[PDB]
Every structure is written in structure tokens, then in C-alpha cells.
Amino acid sequence: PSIMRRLPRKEGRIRKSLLGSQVWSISRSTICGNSDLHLDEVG
Amino acid sequence: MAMQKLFTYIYEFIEYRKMVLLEEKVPYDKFVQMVLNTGFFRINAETLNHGIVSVFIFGANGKYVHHGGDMRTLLTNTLNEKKHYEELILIVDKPVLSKKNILDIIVEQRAANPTIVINIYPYHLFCINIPKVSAIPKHKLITQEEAQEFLGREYLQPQDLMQISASDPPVVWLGGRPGDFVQIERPSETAMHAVVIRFITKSKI
Amino acid sequence: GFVQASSQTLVIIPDNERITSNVLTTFEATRLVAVRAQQLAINGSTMLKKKYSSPIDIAKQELFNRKIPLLVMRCIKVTPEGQKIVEIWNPREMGIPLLD
Amino acid sequence: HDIEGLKQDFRLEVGDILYRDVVTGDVAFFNRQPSLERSSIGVHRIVVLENPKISTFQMNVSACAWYNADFDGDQMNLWVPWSVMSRVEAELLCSVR
Amino acid sequence: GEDSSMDDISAYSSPGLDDPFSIEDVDISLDVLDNLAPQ
Ligand SMILES: [Mg+2]
């Protein structure tokens, strides 16, 4: 382990922590079709 | 067939830059004879402000492009000639542009002569009428006062504008120098045409 | 060395020399409504006449009815002599984009 | 304070922040990865599905063009803006219209 | 010459620049990779 090894890659400091973020108050699910919903609506 | 194209379009280049020729134009056969025997051809032109511009067309097999001593001697004697020089154009074959020694003589002659513009260009830059090429938009040098007014209205500095090299073929045919501004009117497929202003920077060679 | 940059003086372009548009951008209108809605969530003091049960609707109606107590500052340039040339625009006198 | 650990003499006071459930009509950002276009995140009006046996995000098939999505097993992200500033921005800037 | 105690260990488990298929510049979750299914 080294200080500068934390930086470079996609799993590194800059890309994983600074340019992206783990966040709270978020949900994920499989999407499904529903023809009774408007185009600007989500079930 | 670079010599044949050069023999016409170098004079077209002189006319496009608005200069008067100083010598009588020789036919093409003795042009090639002088290029092969003397090693180069010299064309002199007079500018509106009385500046003298001499153009050296160097043959690809001549000694001046293979030996730096001959080029140094020729440039030293031509720049020591008592004429109101303002611009020397040294037209050489493209591979000559990769020879470090020749370019070193070029930059050393520049250093010894700070008030005289020294430029060395490849063959293809004078084998067309560059302004009339369809892919080349319309370039036009603008005055310092107009550029200052434009920059003042825009709250801009000359270093914020897009920049163009002084060795760009349209700029060469214009005679643009570093520190000048060139207005380019260019076709647009969104607005049917557009205008930009570019800041001319140093030549690459 | 002198890490601290020197203070600037705010140079406001006179209203008859402004070059930017008199119509709010969608970004500017959204920012105005968001800021004003947060202010109303802080205070709740408004000069709007009709009653609304949410800060956002009060903010949009204040923008639409030209009663919003905010000004838009468009920073034009930062002079290296210290001036900060800006333009001040009154959204109550501006065109309002299509916020639908 | 949690609502199940709430005192007998408790009441809402001007300046309190109530964290309420998501209801129909709220705006939410809808995202499918990879986010390649700028319609890959869009703001939709929430319709809450009262059926307790439904775990899917449901949308109209004509909305799938915004996300390059289909219903073979795609998963999508959803977050509801709770901040006032983000709620204003969601419905004025990021709405799928 | 017949000793086997100091033989090269890597000489047993042996026969004797970007990855084109790696999602390295694609910031996608590993639980969502079914969104890449060709269908
Ligand atoms: Mg799929």
C-alpha cells in the first residue's frame, strides 16, 4: 500500500470518490410497462 | 512537377500580395536551367511601402540545402546587400524542413538580423493559388484600430482569441505577421456563414 | 508569498450600456425561483396576494407577477487592475422564459 | 426526533422540518445506466402504486425512448428531491418535457 | 544435476494496452450489467 496508489485508476480516489459518489435517499428496481401512466409519470 | 507549378504560382503569389516585380520574368526553360546550374532562382519584388522582398527557390539537389556552409554564406551575403529588405522567402523541398542544420542557419541569420523577417517554406505552399482553393475560407487582415475596437466591445484581450500560425498558407499569402489579426469569413451549415477573428502567432519553422 | 488576492471594486455598468439580454434565461429564472422559495421557507414574508400552501408556488407566482425581491448580477469581466465589471438586471422588468 | 418516539405534548412549530412520505404528484429523477445522453436522467411525476405486491418501477412504453430502455430486465434508479431548491430545479429544468 | 529441491517453481505451473472488452471508462454498477444485454 502507498499514498499515490490510491489516486490513479477507476477504483481510485479521483474517479470513485471525487467524480462520483455513493449517495443516500435513492432507490433502484426493475422497470416494467404500464400503459395507464402518462409519459411524464413513473409508477 | 513541382517546378512547373512553382514557376506560375510564385508569380501569382507575388501578385496576390500586391507587389511590383523588379526584374524581367524569364521563360520556364531557362528558369529550370538557372535552378539546376546556379542552384537557386531569385525573384525580387517591391512592396507599396518601398520594402524589398526577395524569394529564393532552391533546387532539391542543390548544394545550399545539403551543406549548411553554403546556405550560411548565401544568406550572409544577401542580407549584407544594400537593399531595403523586409522579407526573404526561401522555398525549399519538404525534406529540407527536417534538416536541423539548415534550420539552425536560418534561426542564426534571424538572430543576427532582428529587423528582417526570414521565412522558409515547402514547395506545396506555392504550387496552387491558395486563396482560390475551395476548402479555404476568406481570410483578410484587419487593422489594429478595428481589432482594438472589437476587443473593447467584447471585453477581451488579444490572448483570448483563437490563434493562427503565421506559416498558415492563407496567412502566408496574406503576408500576416505575429501580432496581427485576421478576420475569416467562413461558410456555415447552421447560419449560412460566420465571421471569426484570429490572432496571428509565431511561425512554426 | 502574497497568497491573498487583493480586494476588488464592483463596477456596475450603467443601465443604458448593458449588452446582455433583457430576457431571463431558464437557468436564471429557475435559480431565482429556487432562491426565493428557500427564503420563503426561512421567513414566509411575502407581498403576494393570493394564498398558496407551498413556497415554490409563491415563488413562481412572485416571479410571474413581477414582485420578486431579487436582482440578477451578470459578472462580465475581472480587470487585472482590481475592477469587477458586472451588470445588474431587475427580474421585475425582464422577460420571463417559458416555465411550464 | 423519530415519530414513534414522539412526546405527548409535541406539536409542529413554524421553523420545523417535517420529513413526510412520497405522495402522488411529487417529482423524482429517473435514471438508466449507462447515462449516455442528457435525457438519461429525467424528472417524472410520481404515481404511488398502492398494491403491496408490486416492486417495479412502472412507466409508459413511450417514455422508454428517453432512456434507451426496455422491459427485458433493465433496472433504473430513482431518487426524490427533498430539498426545496432541488425540487424547483427538478420541475423547471429537468422535467422530461 | 538430478536435484529437484531448487527447481524453478514457476516452471511447473506453466506451459513451458487497454483491454478492448473491459468496461474501465464506463461508470456502471455491477448489479445493473443486465442493462447491457443485447436482447
Ligand atoms: Mg434490456
Side-chain angles (χ1 to χ4, degrees), chain B residues 87-109:
Chain B
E87 168 80 29
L88 288 185
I89 290 104
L90 313 182
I91 301 172
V92 300
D93 203 347
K94 187 182 178 180
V96 183
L97 279 310
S98 297
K99 317 238 196 102
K100 197 166 325 322
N101 44 1
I102 298 292
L103 307 182
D104 283 333
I105 287 85
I106 298 308
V107 317
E108 170 244 302
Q109 291 324 303

mmCIF file with all atom_site columns, all heavy atoms in Angstrom, chain B residues 87-109:
data_model
loop_
_atom_site.group_PDB
_atom_site.id
_atom_site.type_symbol
_atom_site.label_atom_id
_atom_site.label_alt_id
_atom_site.label_comp_id
_atom_site.label_asym_id
_atom_site.label_entity_id
_atom_site.label_seq_id
_atom_site.pdbx_PDB_ins_code
_atom_site.Cartn_x
_atom_site.Cartn_y
_atom_site.Cartn_z
_atom_site.occupancy
_atom_site.B_iso_or_equiv
_atom_site.pdbx_formal_charge
_atom_site.auth_seq_id
_atom_site.auth_comp_id
_atom_site.auth_asym_id
_atom_site.auth_atom_id
_atom_site.pdbx_PDB_model_num
ATOM 1   N N   . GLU B 1 87  ? 11.669 41.138 -46.183 1.00 0.00 ? 87  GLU B N   1
ATOM 2   C CA  . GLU B 1 87  ? 11.137 39.780 -46.142 1.00 0.00 ? 87  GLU B CA  1
ATOM 3   C C   . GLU B 1 87  ? 11.911 38.921 -47.128 1.00 0.00 ? 87  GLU B C   1
ATOM 4   O O   . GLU B 1 87  ? 12.028 39.284 -48.301 1.00 0.00 ? 87  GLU B O   1
ATOM 5   C CB  . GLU B 1 87  ? 9.644  39.781 -46.475 1.00 0.00 ? 87  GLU B CB  1
ATOM 6   C CG  . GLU B 1 87  ? 9.052  38.413 -46.745 1.00 0.00 ? 87  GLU B CG  1
ATOM 7   C CD  . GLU B 1 87  ? 8.739  37.646 -45.486 1.00 0.00 ? 87  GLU B CD  1
ATOM 8   O OE1 . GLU B 1 87  ? 8.458  38.287 -44.454 1.00 0.00 ? 87  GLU B OE1 1
ATOM 9   O OE2 . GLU B 1 87  ? 8.768  36.399 -45.527 1.00 0.00 ? 87  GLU B OE2 1
ATOM 10  N N   . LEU B 1 88  ? 12.437 37.796 -46.657 1.00 0.00 ? 88  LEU B N   1
ATOM 11  C CA  . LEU B 1 88  ? 13.076 36.803 -47.505 1.00 0.00 ? 88  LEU B CA  1
ATOM 12  C C   . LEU B 1 88  ? 12.273 35.514 -47.451 1.00 0.00 ? 88  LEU B C   1
ATOM 13  O O   . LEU B 1 88  ? 12.000 34.994 -46.364 1.00 0.00 ? 88  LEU B O   1
ATOM 14  C CB  . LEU B 1 88  ? 14.517 36.536 -47.062 1.00 0.00 ? 88  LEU B CB  1
ATOM 15  C CG  . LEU B 1 88  ? 15.579 37.603 -47.326 1.00 0.00 ? 88  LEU B CG  1
ATOM 16  C CD1 . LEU B 1 88  ? 16.947 37.087 -46.926 1.00 0.00 ? 88  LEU B CD1 1
ATOM 17  C CD2 . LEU B 1 88  ? 15.574 38.017 -48.781 1.00 0.00 ? 88  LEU B CD2 1
ATOM 18  N N   . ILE B 1 89  ? 11.898 34.998 -48.617 1.00 0.00 ? 89  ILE B N   1
ATOM 19  C CA  . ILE B 1 89  ? 11.194 33.726 -48.721 1.00 0.00 ? 89  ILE B CA  1
ATOM 20  C C   . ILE B 1 89  ? 12.151 32.712 -49.328 1.00 0.00 ? 89  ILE B C   1
ATOM 21  O O   . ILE B 1 89  ? 12.610 32.881 -50.463 1.00 0.00 ? 89  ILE B O   1
ATOM 22  C CB  . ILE B 1 89  ? 9.908  33.840 -49.554 1.00 0.00 ? 89  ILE B CB  1
ATOM 23  C CG1 . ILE B 1 89  ? 8.847  34.644 -48.807 1.00 0.00 ? 89  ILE B CG1 1
ATOM 24  C CG2 . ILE B 1 89  ? 9.362  32.468 -49.879 1.00 0.00 ? 89  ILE B CG2 1
ATOM 25  C CD1 . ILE B 1 89  ? 8.686  36.040 -49.312 1.00 0.00 ? 89  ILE B CD1 1
ATOM 26  N N   . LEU B 1 90  ? 12.452 31.665 -48.574 1.00 0.00 ? 90  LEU B N   1
ATOM 27  C CA  . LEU B 1 90  ? 13.341 30.597 -49.014 1.00 0.00 ? 90  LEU B CA  1
ATOM 28  C C   . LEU B 1 90  ? 12.479 29.363 -49.259 1.00 0.00 ? 90  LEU B C   1
ATOM 29  O O   . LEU B 1 90  ? 12.068 28.684 -48.314 1.00 0.00 ? 90  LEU B O   1
ATOM 30  C CB  . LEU B 1 90  ? 14.429 30.330 -47.978 1.00 0.00 ? 90  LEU B CB  1
ATOM 31  C CG  . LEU B 1 90  ? 15.153 31.559 -47.424 1.00 0.00 ? 90  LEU B CG  1
ATOM 32  C CD1 . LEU B 1 90  ? 16.227 31.147 -46.444 1.00 0.00 ? 90  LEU B CD1 1
ATOM 33  C CD2 . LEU B 1 90  ? 15.747 32.388 -48.544 1.00 0.00 ? 90  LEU B CD2 1
ATOM 34  N N   . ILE B 1 91  ? 12.206 29.077 -50.526 1.00 0.00 ? 91  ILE B N   1
ATOM 35  C CA  . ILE B 1 91  ? 11.348 27.962 -50.901 1.00 0.00 ? 91  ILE B CA  1
ATOM 36  C C   . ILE B 1 91  ? 12.235 26.741 -51.108 1.00 0.00 ? 91  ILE B C   1
ATOM 37  O O   . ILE B 1 91  ? 13.054 26.704 -52.028 1.00 0.00 ? 91  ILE B O   1
ATOM 38  C CB  . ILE B 1 91  ? 10.532 28.280 -52.158 1.00 0.00 ? 91  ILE B CB  1
ATOM 39  C CG1 . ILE B 1 91  ? 9.672  29.518 -51.924 1.00 0.00 ? 91  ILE B CG1 1
ATOM 40  C CG2 . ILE B 1 91  ? 9.658  27.100 -52.540 1.00 0.00 ? 91  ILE B CG2 1
ATOM 41  C CD1 . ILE B 1 91  ? 8.998  30.013 -53.159 1.00 0.00 ? 91  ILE B CD1 1
ATOM 42  N N   . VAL B 1 92  ? 12.070 25.739 -50.250 1.00 0.00 ? 92  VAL B N   1
ATOM 43  C CA  . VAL B 1 92  ? 12.882 24.536 -50.285 1.00 0.00 ? 92  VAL B CA  1
ATOM 44  C C   . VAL B 1 92  ? 11.962 23.325 -50.368 1.00 0.00 ? 92  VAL B C   1
ATOM 45  O O   . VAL B 1 92  ? 10.765 23.403 -50.098 1.00 0.00 ? 92  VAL B O   1
ATOM 46  C CB  . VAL B 1 92  ? 13.816 24.423 -49.066 1.00 0.00 ? 92  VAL B CB  1
ATOM 47  C CG1 . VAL B 1 92  ? 14.757 25.612 -48.999 1.00 0.00 ? 92  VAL B CG1 1
ATOM 48  C CG2 . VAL B 1 92  ? 12.998 24.312 -47.797 1.00 0.00 ? 92  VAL B CG2 1
ATOM 49  N N   . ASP B 1 93  ? 12.547 22.197 -50.752 1.00 0.00 ? 93  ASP B N   1
ATOM 50  C CA  . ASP B 1 93  ? 11.812 20.946 -50.786 1.00 0.00 ? 93  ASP B CA  1
ATOM 51  C C   . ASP B 1 93  ? 11.397 20.547 -49.373 1.00 0.00 ? 93  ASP B C   1
ATOM 52  O O   . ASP B 1 93  ? 12.022 20.931 -48.381 1.00 0.00 ? 93  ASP B O   1
ATOM 53  C CB  . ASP B 1 93  ? 12.662 19.849 -51.427 1.00 0.00 ? 93  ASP B CB  1
ATOM 54  C CG  . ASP B 1 93  ? 11.826 18.723 -51.999 1.00 0.00 ? 93  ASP B CG  1
ATOM 55  O OD1 . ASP B 1 93  ? 10.619 18.658 -51.690 1.00 0.00 ? 93  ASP B OD1 1
ATOM 56  O OD2 . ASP B 1 93  ? 12.378 17.902 -52.761 1.00 0.00 ? 93  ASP B OD2 1
ATOM 57  N N   . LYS B 1 94  ? 10.311 19.782 -49.290 1.00 0.00 ? 94  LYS B N   1
ATOM 58  C CA  . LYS B 1 94  ? 9.784  19.384 -47.987 1.00 0.00 ? 94  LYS B CA  1
ATOM 59  C C   . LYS B 1 94  ? 10.805 18.689 -47.091 1.00 0.00 ? 94  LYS B C   1
ATOM 60  O O   . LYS B 1 94  ? 10.877 19.050 -45.902 1.00 0.00 ? 94  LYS B O   1
ATOM 61  C CB  . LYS B 1 94  ? 8.547  18.499 -48.180 1.00 0.00 ? 94  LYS B CB  1
ATOM 62  C CG  . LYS B 1 94  ? 7.827  18.157 -46.894 1.00 0.00 ? 94  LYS B CG  1
ATOM 63  C CD  . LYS B 1 94  ? 6.647  17.246 -47.166 1.00 0.00 ? 94  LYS B CD  1
ATOM 64  C CE  . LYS B 1 94  ? 5.951  16.847 -45.881 1.00 0.00 ? 94  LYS B CE  1
ATOM 65  N NZ  . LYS B 1 94  ? 4.797  15.947 -46.141 1.00 0.00 ? 94  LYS B NZ  1
ATOM 66  N N   . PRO B 1 95  ? 11.605 17.719 -47.556 1.00 0.00 ? 95  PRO B N   1
ATOM 67  C CA  . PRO B 1 95  ? 12.584 17.093 -46.649 1.00 0.00 ? 95  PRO B CA  1
ATOM 68  C C   . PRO B 1 95  ? 13.573 18.074 -46.047 1.00 0.00 ? 95  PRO B C   1
ATOM 69  O O   . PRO B 1 95  ? 14.049 17.833 -44.930 1.00 0.00 ? 95  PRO B O   1
ATOM 70  C CB  . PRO B 1 95  ? 13.290 16.068 -47.546 1.00 0.00 ? 95  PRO B CB  1
ATOM 71  C CG  . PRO B 1 95  ? 12.314 15.782 -48.622 1.00 0.00 ? 95  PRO B CG  1
ATOM 72  C CD  . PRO B 1 95  ? 11.621 17.075 -48.882 1.00 0.00 ? 95  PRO B CD  1
ATOM 73  N N   . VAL B 1 96  ? 13.881 19.173 -46.738 1.00 0.00 ? 96  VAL B N   1
ATOM 74  C CA  . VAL B 1 96  ? 14.793 20.175 -46.196 1.00 0.00 ? 96  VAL B CA  1
ATOM 75  C C   . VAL B 1 96  ? 14.263 20.738 -44.885 1.00 0.00 ? 96  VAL B C   1
ATOM 76  O O   . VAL B 1 96  ? 15.040 21.167 -44.024 1.00 0.00 ? 96  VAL B O   1
ATOM 77  C CB  . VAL B 1 96  ? 15.028 21.289 -47.236 1.00 0.00 ? 96  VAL B CB  1
ATOM 78  C CG1 . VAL B 1 96  ? 16.034 22.307 -46.725 1.00 0.00 ? 96  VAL B CG1 1
ATOM 79  C CG2 . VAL B 1 96  ? 15.488 20.693 -48.551 1.00 0.00 ? 96  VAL B CG2 1
ATOM 80  N N   . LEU B 1 97  ? 12.941 20.737 -44.701 1.00 0.00 ? 97  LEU B N   1
ATOM 81  C CA  . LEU B 1 97  ? 12.364 21.246 -43.463 1.00 0.00 ? 97  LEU B CA  1
ATOM 82  C C   . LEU B 1 97  ? 12.681 20.365 -42.262 1.00 0.00 ? 97  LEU B C   1
ATOM 83  O O   . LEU B 1 97  ? 12.476 20.803 -41.125 1.00 0.00 ? 97  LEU B O   1
ATOM 84  C CB  . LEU B 1 97  ? 10.847 21.388 -43.606 1.00 0.00 ? 97  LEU B CB  1
ATOM 85  C CG  . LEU B 1 97  ? 10.302 22.631 -44.318 1.00 0.00 ? 97  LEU B CG  1
ATOM 86  C CD1 . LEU B 1 97  ? 10.915 23.896 -43.748 1.00 0.00 ? 97  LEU B CD1 1
ATOM 87  C CD2 . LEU B 1 97  ? 10.516 22.556 -45.821 1.00 0.00 ? 97  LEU B CD2 1
ATOM 88  N N   . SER B 1 98  ? 13.168 19.145 -42.478 1.00 0.00 ? 98  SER B N   1
ATOM 89  C CA  . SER B 1 98  ? 13.527 18.250 -41.389 1.00 0.00 ? 98  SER B CA  1
ATOM 90  C C   . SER B 1 98  ? 15.022 18.233 -41.102 1.00 0.00 ? 98  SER B C   1
ATOM 91  O O   . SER B 1 98  ? 15.454 17.520 -40.192 1.00 0.00 ? 98  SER B O   1
ATOM 92  C CB  . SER B 1 98  ? 13.045 16.828 -41.694 1.00 0.00 ? 98  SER B CB  1
ATOM 93  O OG  . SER B 1 98  ? 11.632 16.775 -41.792 1.00 0.00 ? 98  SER B OG  1
ATOM 94  N N   . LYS B 1 99  ? 15.817 18.997 -41.845 1.00 0.00 ? 99  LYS B N   1
ATOM 95  C CA  . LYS B 1 99  ? 17.260 19.038 -41.646 1.00 0.00 ? 99  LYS B CA  1
ATOM 96  C C   . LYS B 1 99  ? 17.588 20.088 -40.592 1.00 0.00 ? 99  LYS B C   1
ATOM 97  O O   . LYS B 1 99  ? 17.393 21.287 -40.820 1.00 0.00 ? 99  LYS B O   1
ATOM 98  C CB  . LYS B 1 99  ? 17.978 19.339 -42.960 1.00 0.00 ? 99  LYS B CB  1
ATOM 99  C CG  . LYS B 1 99  ? 17.418 18.580 -44.144 1.00 0.00 ? 99  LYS B CG  1
ATOM 100 C CD  . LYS B 1 99  ? 18.482 17.739 -44.819 1.00 0.00 ? 99  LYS B CD  1
ATOM 101 C CE  . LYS B 1 99  ? 18.034 17.306 -46.202 1.00 0.00 ? 99  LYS B CE  1
ATOM 102 N NZ  . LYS B 1 99  ? 18.670 18.123 -47.272 1.00 0.00 ? 99  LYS B NZ  1
ATOM 103 N N   . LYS B 1 100 ? 18.096 19.632 -39.446 1.00 0.00 ? 100 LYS B N   1
ATOM 104 C CA  . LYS B 1 100 ? 18.317 20.523 -38.312 1.00 0.00 ? 100 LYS B CA  1
ATOM 105 C C   . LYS B 1 100 ? 19.367 21.584 -38.609 1.00 0.00 ? 100 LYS B C   1
ATOM 106 O O   . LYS B 1 100 ? 19.236 22.722 -38.149 1.00 0.00 ? 100 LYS B O   1
ATOM 107 C CB  . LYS B 1 100 ? 18.727 19.710 -37.086 1.00 0.00 ? 100 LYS B CB  1
ATOM 108 C CG  . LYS B 1 100 ? 18.582 20.455 -35.766 1.00 0.00 ? 100 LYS B CG  1
ATOM 109 C CD  . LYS B 1 100 ? 18.674 19.544 -34.534 1.00 0.00 ? 100 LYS B CD  1
ATOM 110 C CE  . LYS B 1 100 ? 18.067 18.143 -34.699 1.00 0.00 ? 100 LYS B CE  1
ATOM 111 N NZ  . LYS B 1 100 ? 16.811 18.042 -35.506 1.00 0.00 ? 100 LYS B NZ  1
ATOM 112 N N   . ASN B 1 101 ? 20.418 21.231 -39.351 1.00 0.00 ? 101 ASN B N   1
ATOM 113 C CA  . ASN B 1 101 ? 21.479 22.196 -39.621 1.00 0.00 ? 101 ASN B CA  1
ATOM 114 C C   . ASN B 1 101 ? 20.968 23.379 -40.436 1.00 0.00 ? 101 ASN B C   1
ATOM 115 O O   . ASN B 1 101 ? 21.258 24.533 -40.105 1.00 0.00 ? 101 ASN B O   1
ATOM 116 C CB  . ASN B 1 101 ? 22.644 21.512 -40.335 1.00 0.00 ? 101 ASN B CB  1
ATOM 117 C CG  . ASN B 1 101 ? 22.186 20.585 -41.436 1.00 0.00 ? 101 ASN B CG  1
ATOM 118 O OD1 . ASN B 1 101 ? 20.994 20.459 -41.701 1.00 0.00 ? 101 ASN B OD1 1
ATOM 119 N ND2 . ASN B 1 101 ? 23.137 19.925 -42.084 1.00 0.00 ? 101 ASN B ND2 1
ATOM 120 N N   . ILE B 1 102 ? 20.199 23.113 -41.494 1.00 0.00 ? 102 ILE B N   1
ATOM 121 C CA  . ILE B 1 102 ? 19.704 24.197 -42.340 1.00 0.00 ? 102 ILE B CA  1
ATOM 122 C C   . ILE B 1 102 ? 18.836 25.147 -41.525 1.00 0.00 ? 102 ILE B C   1
ATOM 123 O O   . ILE B 1 102 ? 18.978 26.374 -41.603 1.00 0.00 ? 102 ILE B O   1
ATOM 124 C CB  . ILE B 1 102 ? 18.940 23.626 -43.547 1.00 0.00 ? 102 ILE B CB  1
ATOM 125 C CG1 . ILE B 1 102 ? 19.872 22.776 -44.411 1.00 0.00 ? 102 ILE B CG1 1
ATOM 126 C CG2 . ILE B 1 102 ? 18.328 24.748 -44.366 1.00 0.00 ? 102 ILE B CG2 1
ATOM 127 C CD1 . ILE B 1 102 ? 20.949 23.571 -45.111 1.00 0.00 ? 102 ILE B CD1 1
ATOM 128 N N   . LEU B 1 103 ? 17.940 24.589 -40.712 1.00 0.00 ? 103 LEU B N   1
ATOM 129 C CA  . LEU B 1 103 ? 17.107 25.420 -39.854 1.00 0.00 ? 103 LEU B CA  1
ATOM 130 C C   . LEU B 1 103 ? 17.943 26.183 -38.834 1.00 0.00 ? 103 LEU B C   1
ATOM 131 O O   . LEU B 1 103 ? 17.582 27.300 -38.455 1.00 0.00 ? 103 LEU B O   1
ATOM 132 C CB  . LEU B 1 103 ? 16.061 24.560 -39.149 1.00 0.00 ? 103 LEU B CB  1
ATOM 133 C CG  . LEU B 1 103 ? 15.201 23.680 -40.059 1.00 0.00 ? 103 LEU B CG  1
ATOM 134 C CD1 . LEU B 1 103 ? 14.168 22.916 -39.248 1.00 0.00 ? 103 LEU B CD1 1
ATOM 135 C CD2 . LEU B 1 103 ? 14.538 24.507 -41.150 1.00 0.00 ? 103 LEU B CD2 1
ATOM 136 N N   . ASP B 1 104 ? 19.054 25.600 -38.378 1.00 0.00 ? 104 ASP B N   1
ATOM 137 C CA  . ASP B 1 104 ? 19.927 26.311 -37.450 1.00 0.00 ? 104 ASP B CA  1
ATOM 138 C C   . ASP B 1 104 ? 20.559 27.529 -38.110 1.00 0.00 ? 104 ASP B C   1
ATOM 139 O O   . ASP B 1 104 ? 20.622 28.604 -37.505 1.00 0.00 ? 104 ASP B O   1
ATOM 140 C CB  . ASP B 1 104 ? 20.999 25.368 -36.907 1.00 0.00 ? 104 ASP B CB  1
ATOM 141 C CG  . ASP B 1 104 ? 20.463 24.434 -35.838 1.00 0.00 ? 104 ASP B CG  1
ATOM 142 O OD1 . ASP B 1 104 ? 19.488 24.807 -35.154 1.00 0.00 ? 104 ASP B OD1 1
ATOM 143 O OD2 . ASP B 1 104 ? 21.019 23.328 -35.677 1.00 0.00 ? 104 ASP B OD2 1
ATOM 144 N N   . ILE B 1 105 ? 21.029 27.382 -39.352 1.00 0.00 ? 105 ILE B N   1
ATOM 145 C CA  . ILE B 1 105 ? 21.483 28.557 -40.100 1.00 0.00 ? 105 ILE B CA  1
ATOM 146 C C   . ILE B 1 105 ? 20.356 29.571 -40.254 1.00 0.00 ? 105 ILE B C   1
ATOM 147 O O   . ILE B 1 105 ? 20.578 30.783 -40.150 1.00 0.00 ? 105 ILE B O   1
ATOM 148 C CB  . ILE B 1 105 ? 22.094 28.174 -41.466 1.00 0.00 ? 105 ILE B CB  1
ATOM 149 C CG1 . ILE B 1 105 ? 23.475 27.515 -41.320 1.00 0.00 ? 105 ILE B CG1 1
ATOM 150 C CG2 . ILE B 1 105 ? 22.172 29.382 -42.388 1.00 0.00 ? 105 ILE B CG2 1
ATOM 151 C CD1 . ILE B 1 105 ? 23.503 26.057 -41.058 1.00 0.00 ? 105 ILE B CD1 1
ATOM 152 N N   . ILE B 1 106 ? 19.129 29.099 -40.493 1.00 0.00 ? 106 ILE B N   1
ATOM 153 C CA  . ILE B 1 106 ? 18.005 30.023 -40.658 1.00 0.00 ? 106 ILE B CA  1
ATOM 154 C C   . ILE B 1 106 ? 17.798 30.852 -39.393 1.00 0.00 ? 106 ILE B C   1
ATOM 155 O O   . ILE B 1 106 ? 17.706 32.086 -39.443 1.00 0.00 ? 106 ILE B O   1
ATOM 156 C CB  . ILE B 1 106 ? 16.726 29.257 -41.043 1.00 0.00 ? 106 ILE B CB  1
ATOM 157 C CG1 . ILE B 1 106 ? 16.906 28.542 -42.380 1.00 0.00 ? 106 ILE B CG1 1
ATOM 158 C CG2 . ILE B 1 106 ? 15.539 30.202 -41.102 1.00 0.00 ? 106 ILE B CG2 1
ATOM 159 C CD1 . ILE B 1 106 ? 17.408 29.435 -43.476 1.00 0.00 ? 106 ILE B CD1 1
ATOM 160 N N   . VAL B 1 107 ? 17.732 30.186 -38.240 1.00 0.00 ? 107 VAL B N   1
ATOM 161 C CA  . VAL B 1 107 ? 17.479 30.910 -36.995 1.00 0.00 ? 107 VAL B CA  1
ATOM 162 C C   . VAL B 1 107 ? 18.676 31.768 -36.591 1.00 0.00 ? 107 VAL B C   1
ATOM 163 O O   . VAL B 1 107 ? 18.498 32.827 -35.984 1.00 0.00 ? 107 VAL B O   1
ATOM 164 C CB  . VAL B 1 107 ? 17.060 29.951 -35.865 1.00 0.00 ? 107 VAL B CB  1
ATOM 165 C CG1 . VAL B 1 107 ? 16.063 28.933 -36.376 1.00 0.00 ? 107 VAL B CG1 1
ATOM 166 C CG2 . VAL B 1 107 ? 18.263 29.254 -35.264 1.00 0.00 ? 107 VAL B CG2 1
ATOM 167 N N   . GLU B 1 108 ? 19.902 31.357 -36.922 1.00 0.00 ? 108 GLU B N   1
ATOM 168 C CA  . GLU B 1 108 ? 21.055 32.195 -36.626 1.00 0.00 ? 108 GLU B CA  1
ATOM 169 C C   . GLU B 1 108 ? 21.102 33.442 -37.499 1.00 0.00 ? 108 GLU B C   1
ATOM 170 O O   . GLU B 1 108 ? 21.469 34.516 -37.007 1.00 0.00 ? 108 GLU B O   1
ATOM 171 C CB  . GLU B 1 108 ? 22.344 31.384 -36.778 1.00 0.00 ? 108 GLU B CB  1
ATOM 172 C CG  . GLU B 1 108 ? 23.620 32.202 -36.718 1.00 0.00 ? 108 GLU B CG  1
ATOM 173 C CD  . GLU B 1 108 ? 24.388 32.177 -38.020 1.00 0.00 ? 108 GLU B CD  1
ATOM 174 O OE1 . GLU B 1 108 ? 24.755 31.073 -38.471 1.00 0.00 ? 108 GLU B OE1 1
ATOM 175 O OE2 . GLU B 1 108 ? 24.626 33.261 -38.593 1.00 0.00 ? 108 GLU B OE2 1
ATOM 176 N N   . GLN B 1 109 ? 20.728 33.327 -38.776 1.00 0.00 ? 109 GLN B N   1
ATOM 177 C CA  . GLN B 1 109 ? 20.573 34.513 -39.611 1.00 0.00 ? 109 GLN B CA  1
ATOM 178 C C   . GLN B 1 109 ? 19.449 35.406 -39.107 1.00 0.00 ? 109 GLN B C   1
ATOM 179 O O   . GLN B 1 109 ? 19.549 36.634 -39.202 1.00 0.00 ? 109 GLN B O   1
ATOM 180 C CB  . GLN B 1 109 ? 20.321 34.111 -41.064 1.00 0.00 ? 109 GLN B CB  1
ATOM 181 C CG  . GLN B 1 109 ? 21.510 33.475 -41.770 1.00 0.00 ? 109 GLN B CG  1
ATOM 182 C CD  . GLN B 1 109 ? 22.837 34.080 -41.362 1.00 0.00 ? 109 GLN B CD  1
ATOM 183 O OE1 . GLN B 1 109 ? 23.051 35.285 -41.491 1.00 0.00 ? 109 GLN B OE1 1
ATOM 184 N NE2 . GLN B 1 109 ? 23.741 33.243 -40.873 1.00 0.00 ? 109 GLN B NE2 1
#
